Amino acid sequence: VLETSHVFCCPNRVRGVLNWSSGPRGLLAFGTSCSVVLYDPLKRVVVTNLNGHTARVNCIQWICKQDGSPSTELVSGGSDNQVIHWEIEDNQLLKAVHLQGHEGPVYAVHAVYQRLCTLIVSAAADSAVRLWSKKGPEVMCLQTLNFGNGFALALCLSFLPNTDVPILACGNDDCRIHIFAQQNDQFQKVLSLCGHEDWIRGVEWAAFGRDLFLASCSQDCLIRIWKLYIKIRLKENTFTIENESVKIAFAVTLETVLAGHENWVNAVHWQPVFYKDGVLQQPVRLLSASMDKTMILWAPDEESGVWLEQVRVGFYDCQFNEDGSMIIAHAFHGALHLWKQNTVNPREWTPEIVISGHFDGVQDLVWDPEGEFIITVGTDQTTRLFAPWKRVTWHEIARPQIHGYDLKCLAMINRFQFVSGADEKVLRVFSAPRNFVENFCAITGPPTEDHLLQNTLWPEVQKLYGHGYEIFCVTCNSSKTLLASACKAAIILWNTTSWKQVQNLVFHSLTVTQMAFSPNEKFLLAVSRDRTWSLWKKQDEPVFSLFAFTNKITSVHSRIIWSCDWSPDSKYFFTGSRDKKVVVWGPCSSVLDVGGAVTAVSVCPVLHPSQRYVVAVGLECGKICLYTWKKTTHCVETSQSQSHTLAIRKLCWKNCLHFASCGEDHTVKIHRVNKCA
Amino acid sequence: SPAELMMLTIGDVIKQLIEAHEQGKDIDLNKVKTKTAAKYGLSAQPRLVDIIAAVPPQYRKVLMPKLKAKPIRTASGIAVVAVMCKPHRCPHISFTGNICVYCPGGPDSDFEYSTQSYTGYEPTSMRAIRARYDPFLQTRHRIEQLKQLGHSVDKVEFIVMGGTFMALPEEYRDYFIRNLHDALSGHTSNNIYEAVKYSERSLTKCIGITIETRPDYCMKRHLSDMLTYGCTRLEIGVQSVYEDVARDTNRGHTVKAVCESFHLAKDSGFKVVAHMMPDLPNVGLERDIEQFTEFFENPAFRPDGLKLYPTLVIRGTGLYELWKSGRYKSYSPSDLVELVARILALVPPWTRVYRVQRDIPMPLVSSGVEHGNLRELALARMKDLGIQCRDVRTREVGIQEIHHKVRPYQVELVRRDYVANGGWETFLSYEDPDQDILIGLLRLRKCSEETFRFELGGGVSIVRELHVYGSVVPVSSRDPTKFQHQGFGMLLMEEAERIAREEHGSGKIAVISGVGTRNYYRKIGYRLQGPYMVKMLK
Ligand SMILES: CCNC(=O)CCNC(=O)[C@H](O)C(C)(C)COP(=O)(O)OP(=O)(O)OC[C@H]1O[C@@H](n2cnc3c(N)ncnc32)[C@H](O)[C@@H]1OP(=O)(O)O
Ligand SMILES: C[C@H]1O[C@@H](n2cnc3c(N)ncnc32)[C@H](O)[C@@H]1O
Ligand code: MET
Ligand code: SF4
Structure with missing residues (x-):
């Protein structure tokens, strides 16, 4: 009874990780850590995800629809x-096929919808290619x-004209x-082009009438275009090929040499053909991309033997719309740029809103008490705030x-106001600047890509010290009076206004793992790395004498604890550890084993009148199952679509259903369930 | 606006010089600069950087010979790129809160951002700070900035800064190294090995890396680890030749361990550069002279690379208070000049000096000498004494031409040998003796009886390094006059092989090489084995 609501992410960094389906209302596909993401530009919403491949996805590839309809097949390497085919259906998958034989990572894929025995070609990092x-x-x-x-x-396939x-x-x-020709059922090395001198960084066919032109976005900072046709003038390279006892002669030679970039040329895309109400035009619009932040859409003219450049507005690839009105590209990292042409001027373009993510991995997040914005932090050394629009x-x-x-x-x-912890021995305190507050209240009663980093800075008010090493955990009490923090073998507690020590605890022997302020502000649970826990009791700045604790034997878990949480009325606490053991506390329940390593645990803020306590458990393998244990049970678990591919980090709940899913896949998923369920 | 006026002057200069080029007319840049500035009402000369910043490529092809700035950056023969590591802690502090008695601010020494033995005000430091210590960003930025000055990047090399590298978590260093290799390859990878295989076929043609370390991390395990990275030379830090000083300096090790580290590393086949530390506490001037003489008289050390750093009392350290208590006193500048002048007279010919004096900003040292330049003062003093030095850097063609404009006339071969750490070292060179100018060199020895790499077991002689100085010549280009592609290396290879076959009496020749340079040896019929290029001798 769980449904996804919002997902936030970014593509990978390697080249060729983005594509558009060529059919009308072309869908947008891009890779991530290990999954694939389908997303639309219409309402700017992620369509869905494919939780398939189990490594850094290298290169995706759409499928050609010669009829001119939305595609429903996909190739992932x-x-x-490991290369996987995907049968798309009604925004879902039918089945996937896992081809085997490659050894190194696969980075070149191309599939052709034959004219079904579809054809596959794929070159892997093992200096080899295979045909399927x-x-x-x-x-x-x-x-x-x-x-x-x-x-x-x-790699790019083609048919003889x-x-x-x-x-x-x-x-x-x-x-x-x-070049290779499949005559006699076998591809035969026919010819070679001794053109420029650098690594080949892309090839593209273009069937223009009877002839076939070729584009080569070279690393040599040059572009060379040849063309195949059928059989004072130069020496063209021709040959004869067998075709039902017919030796058909084909000739190829250079057409043009275009050069307008400085750094390496990464990607080129022909203008895709489409229908002028059933009219299949054959445009010659071309797109280019290079390292040095430069977009050049080359074009010929009525007599332009050397093609004429155009608006150079403007990172390994820039993708092109079906009609050509839209255009998109990814930055070198993280975010991406989306431009659209404007009707008023053929030389007119406007940036467009696009979603983003931490693109490396998120470690923490928070629910605002008011419930309209959540702040997250990742290993990208950034911090982000999310709100509805x-x-x-x-x-x-x-x-x-x-x-x-x-x-x-x-x-x-x-x-x-908030506090963050970093790789230093310092504690920092931030508060929102006024301008941001007014801009936010205006929206609640659409920031762009570049304006954000320019005008989303915050002031610093404090600077705290004391821990002998880098901080490792932090928490604050509900009444907002004291905070807990610990480096990698002492406990330091800080008053809010004073920003000074209140009491110091040195009790454990190994690194601290997690703290828990009692919801009623009556206790403070501490779980560490030495397979032991501690509890400290506030007195009538009351001291925190240890109310109870465990030795190496009284502790139930046989391995390192990871998570802890209280009860809504602070009655009992609950601990999960790597040994896939679940306990309830004195202890008053059996081991609620699930067979999977526990990474996170959390509880409902409010309890049913049935008193059936419910618990959310985040496992180590992306799976997110949920259970329920009233004082004396599985209820529902996540779907294949709604499952991460890495260990969970934190599962916080909405408070005044909904909660938070902070995975290690640098994705932020939110899931809603039935209020009654 | 004046700016467009200078732009117009730039365009005028450009058209004049291209016109001169078309008919092959020769013109002084400064003369036309002055004339254009005057005729356009300019109060100040135009900067040469902006002059280079507007040439069209079809002219940059041939105008650079008259346009490069600060040629000495390639007067050696190989481009140099420096990179910065992430700040961290040295290991010894595990005992007490002691980094080193003379070491500057570390990770937590009253500096916002800094590094151990680095204030944080070096241009490399600001580059790293902007880069947030990211390898790829800073290396791309630096190579772009260098290429701005119209310098070929056909052959490049990497040097890594940072306090300690061996003492870092492995995954981080692997990430770092693969990022470095992808910077030149341009190919995103997944591990070290993939990046290595891809960079093998790249065109940037990387030729090696060197890292600093300390003798604690010198066991054969770490050497084998570094063999996987293609590293060539190492830094240790000797600071003395007297064991007592180490505990006096709270160094936290023994000079012996340094000696066995030298022996083992030389047996493996790396190169090593030492650090010398004159004017130390409890050290007389005569003590310094004697220890420096010992540094070459003893067959124990006889090192290859040398670096010198005079003492500099700096606030924060214990030595700061020691001098502040008026108990640690320095020398007068004349004393330092005499010390350096005497030292330079003692360097053996094979050893090469790389740097003198630190680069610390002036308004921070309580005993910093006024002169940022010292080699010149030493040169003046040794002219006064009429005694000459024989350092490699001071007798290569590049420096000798750029500072004295002397053309080699008669270059011949020269052979020498000695003993170091039990090794039978051997040194070969081509050079012109009459002007004492040198062009090419080679370092080859017999492997010790005790070894770590079994591939060297029996009938094996290792060639530690080979190099010809000069300036960068693209691998396709053949002769811009100059001396970098006349086939010189071939003669040295064949002669060294002949010597190893006969005099060494070995049976198989191995050699270390840069990742790209392997292809070079392929032209001579050398085949790979592990990380070592090798050829059978029969
Ligand atoms: C081991 C890591 N350290 C270094 O590499 C130091 C830098 N190395 C160099 O500057 C040069 O390689 C040398 C010091 C060897 C001087 O070059 P040298 O004069 O000995 O080369 P030779 O004249 O004997 O032979 C010429 C051939 O070397 C080739 N060559 C030059 N550099 C390289 C290279 N990195 N890799 C492979 N081949 C090279 C040239 O293409 C040339 O071939 P050609 O027949 O087309 O002209
Ligand atoms: C890089 C070499 O210089 C030494 N070194 C580093 N910082 C200083 C300093 N402030 N003063 C003197 N020597 C220093 C190191 O100990 C090593 O030997
Ligand atoms: C930068 S100091 C010299 C290298 C190293 N830190 C050592 O002392 O051994
Ligand atoms: S080992 Fe070297 S870098 Fe580290 S504290 Fe000592 S002198 Fe500084």
């Missing part, structure tokens, strides 16, 4: 020699090929192109600080 026939459930590797050394980087004969051009690292869709709105070292601790102070 990840980081551990896929006829329904039947799958096989048609051929395997390799080089003496080096690697291939450019006016026939189904398939032909491939591959660009290796040896500064030249190779009206017109409802939630959006990241502010990045209060950027820090030199990594941040791994977070706690809330007041309506705009």
